[PDB]
Amino acid sequence: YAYFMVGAMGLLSSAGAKSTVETFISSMTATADVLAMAKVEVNLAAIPLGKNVV
Amino acid sequence: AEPEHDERKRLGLKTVIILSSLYLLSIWVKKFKWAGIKTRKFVFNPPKPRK
Amino acid sequence: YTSHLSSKTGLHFGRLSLRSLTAYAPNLMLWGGASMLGLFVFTEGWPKFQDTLYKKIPLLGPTLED
Amino acid sequence: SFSSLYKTFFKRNAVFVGTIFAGAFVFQTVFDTAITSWYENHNKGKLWKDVKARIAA
Amino acid sequence: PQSFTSIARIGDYILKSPVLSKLCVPVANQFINLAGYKKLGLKFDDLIAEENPIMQTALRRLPEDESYARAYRIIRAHQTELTHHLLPRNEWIKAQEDVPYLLPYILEAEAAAKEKDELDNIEVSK
Amino acid sequence: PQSFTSIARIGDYILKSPVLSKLCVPVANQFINLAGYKKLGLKFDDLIAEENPIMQTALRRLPEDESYARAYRIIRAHQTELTHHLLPRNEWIKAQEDVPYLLPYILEAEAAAKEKDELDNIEVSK
Amino acid sequence: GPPSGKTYMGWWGHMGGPKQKGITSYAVSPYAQKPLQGIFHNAVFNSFRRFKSQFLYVLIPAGIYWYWWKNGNEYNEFLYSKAGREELERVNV
Amino acid sequence: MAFRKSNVYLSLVNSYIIDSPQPSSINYWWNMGSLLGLCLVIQIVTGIFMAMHYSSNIELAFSSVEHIMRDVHNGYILRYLHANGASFFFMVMFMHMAKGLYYGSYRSPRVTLWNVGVIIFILTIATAFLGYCCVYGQMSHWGATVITNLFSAIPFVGNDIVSWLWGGFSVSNPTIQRFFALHYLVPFIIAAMVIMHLMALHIHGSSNPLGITGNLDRIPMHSYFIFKDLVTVFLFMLILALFVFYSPNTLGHPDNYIPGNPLVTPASIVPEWYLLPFYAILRSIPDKLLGVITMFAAILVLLVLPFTDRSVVRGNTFKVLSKFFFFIFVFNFVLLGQIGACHVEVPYVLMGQIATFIYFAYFLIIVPVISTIENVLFYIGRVNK
Amino acid sequence: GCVPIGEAGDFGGWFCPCHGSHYDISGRIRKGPAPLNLEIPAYEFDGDKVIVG
Ligand code: HEM
Ligand code: HEM
Ligand SMILES: COc1c(O)c(C)c(C/C=C(\C)CC/C=C(\C)CC/C=C(\C)CC/C=C(/C)CC/C=C(\C)CCC=C(C)C)c(O)c1OC
């Protein structure tokens, strides 16, 4: 019984610690506004032969 | 003002339940291992007055 | 034993002996097992690790749908 | 008898920690699912899941 | 911190006079009984701060048979305060048993220390 | 860290062979001459470090006179290096008097330490 | 404080080094000493003898690596000097 | 009992500063290390006074540095002092390590000190890279991108971890904000590690240059050695002033003074002077995983130098071959940095690969065989029969 | 992850300034620690223009 109480404490503490670590780490991950997908258009008809367009 | 209420309340409910359970468990364990000293006794038997 | 007892010396790098390692082999083996078990426990948000965890346990963890 | 349970689970710390972690994992998942379900059905028509169906016609 | 020489002077002055005694001793006993240490097992020869050097010398001067009793009283008090109960109303300290045995061992040492600390700042004498 | 059992074995093997001895004695002498420690006033029986407990046991076995002389030599070396000078060319440690006085007190204890580290891991035998 | 582990050096009075006897250190005090007793003789002579006694130990490595670096450089600029088709392609390619 | 040993707040300073039995024969390198610590503290102070007037955006980070260098009363002194104090800090850091290698300090008594020191080293390299990213010049941005992409070598977790640390698909506001916050934080952790280094040091004191026991005579720090640290720090302060006033841009490169532009790259991408040795070995071995692992191998080898040398006689003052090999090692290091700074061409690749081989070999195999030769020669020469 | 310089290298294509990845005119690694060729993004041509996203 005593060890089962200690184990319940350990299990709940582990769940809580995992959740807190998840919160703290995912606070540093990519934000929402940094998720802008970029579409670009290039005038190929204006590109000369011996030139690189970037 | 805070387009984050739904998940805030859900998370709060989860945290409250987890913490209340852990509080009760901790109360129990403190009552447990502290009992090793709370129930002790002392029987003072004075020594023989020799010096 | 008259007279020499024919002692033999076990292999050892100072302190650890072959006997101790033989005794501890399953212990460390499933200690590594438990360590990786806890590692799976700790990680849950990685889409790669979540994707890996979804298939191996399909009767307990079918939680991906919106 | 509980002697078997003790000598298979709580005699050895390695298995004890393994079981505590596995139980933590399964508990976390099932607990999250249950709490989300309860918080959901507790508000019928207050969550966008049914509003998106109601608006559709 | 406040030496027991001044306390002794004020106490003698208050107690010697009849009218102030009659007006002040009735409330002192009620004050002590309402204080609290009496029931929990403390004698007033123990509750004082016992860390400053002059009290340290006084403690060093105590005979064995009182130091041991003081040790028992303080440890039992620690225990009972730990368990949040109170002692049963049979092993308390009676009204007539709160006798000060540690007071003279403080007054003598305090007088010696005070009248030695002054002796250095002596004058040419005349 | 490297025991003197292996060093002694290698040394005896090199010295026993006559041709290899004729090959390696002159280079050894010239090396120890250019080593730069005879002049400043050191015997090689001191340069060995004093962190291993076996070294502590070795020193604790020394007689009084050698320990005192070693102390004098080491402190004088400290001072002379502090000055940046070298000793005068009268007390340079002569080659013929670089006797080994401490090696046996290393080997005698090293053998005991090795057999202690071995005998613990004995087998039941037959 | 709790007792600590064994140590080969202590504080003043319990250094723990081997006990010595017969050593007799002297002094002169700094005020009545005229600090720069030797300031040019000691300087020049000791500096030059110490430079002599530890000269090779830096001359040899520095010279070795300088020769190496010079050879590498000279080959490098020989590569990019009217030799990019005959010498470059036989090692680079 | 004297008040110098009663008050705890002052008892500590007594035990570490006022009275500590340093050995008699100490040369100027221990003072070199103390000067190093004082350089750290002046760097921290001027860094705080720098940050009180520094923005933290990415469109407003270069403007902040030009503002602090041009349009603030007595400001450019601060910025050049921070930069050149860092460069001198790395100079003295390498000098302190070289002394440690040479004189036998890394040996058994202070393995913990050696470990804490190499931890401080990797921390310091991280701090310098972070700060060098804080400027967001032209080449600094490329360096940040390269290092934050180094971790992509790890299998399986190669794109998740970078996407976490980088905080985005490209170097942008979160990246620089994160880098600046870390660059501010980590020096305090360095200070904590310095405290740990001191505690692990004082347990057994310093070592004699002769490699001999120092438990015979000793003299206190203050009134003898405090003046030695004072003179060496006066020398450092004057040389640093010479750099920070007369010739400011000599311990660096003239590319940080360029607005960030993820469109073009300089002709040659080079780190600052104190990283070229740890950059040549990257071009050395042409496997991405091999390079990423071999950097940390180049540090772990310093970790494993203890219980590798096996000469019973500490130090390299009395081992001609060992000290000659040490000097060829130090010239190897400088040659490695130089060969890194120059471009990758036909002879240079062979130069660098041979340099890496002989460098790692000196750490691994040269030291033990040379040590055994030294021990056996010493044993045979002085004995006759 | 550092831009190769155009019209430079050992194969007339691209050269990594960081540690020398010689990308041919096709765009494949020849010499250098780079283990993969340079990945080609998705695109859809539309007449005299093109869109990439
Ligand atoms: C913040 C950086 C550091 C500080 C402040 C520091 C501080 C000190 C101090 C005060 C000493 C005593 C004498 C001296 O000043 O040199 C010392 C000695 C020493 N330090 Fe450090 N140190 C630092 C970095 C390192 C590093 C990175 C290493 C090794 C990787 C190291 C290894 C040593 C060693 C071996 C000694 C030996 C002293 C002896 O043998 O006599 N230190 N350090
Ligand atoms: C902890 C306090 C510190 C602060 C507040 C601080 C702040 C700064 C700032 C603002 C810059 C310039 C930012 C930029 O140019 O955009 C900088 C640069 C730098 N810092 Fe720090 N710093 C601190 C500590 C350190 C330490 C401890 C070191 C290394 C020992 C260090 C090394 C550098 C280096 C090398 C640069 C070079 C980049 C440039 O020249 O600006 N800093 N620091
Ligand atoms: C592209 O050309 C190059 C180039 O090729 C190379 C090699 C380099 C050289 C660069 C390097 C060698 C990179 C080295 C840099 C690092 C290793 C830094 C990496 C970053 C970190 C390690 C972050 C550290 C931050 C922390 C907060 C550490 C965490 C702290 C902990 C865990 C302690 C917690 C505290 C307590 C009390 C427990 C260049 O700079 C460069 O550009 C010119």
Ligand code: FES
């Ligand atoms: S970045 Fe391409 S080889 Fe260096």
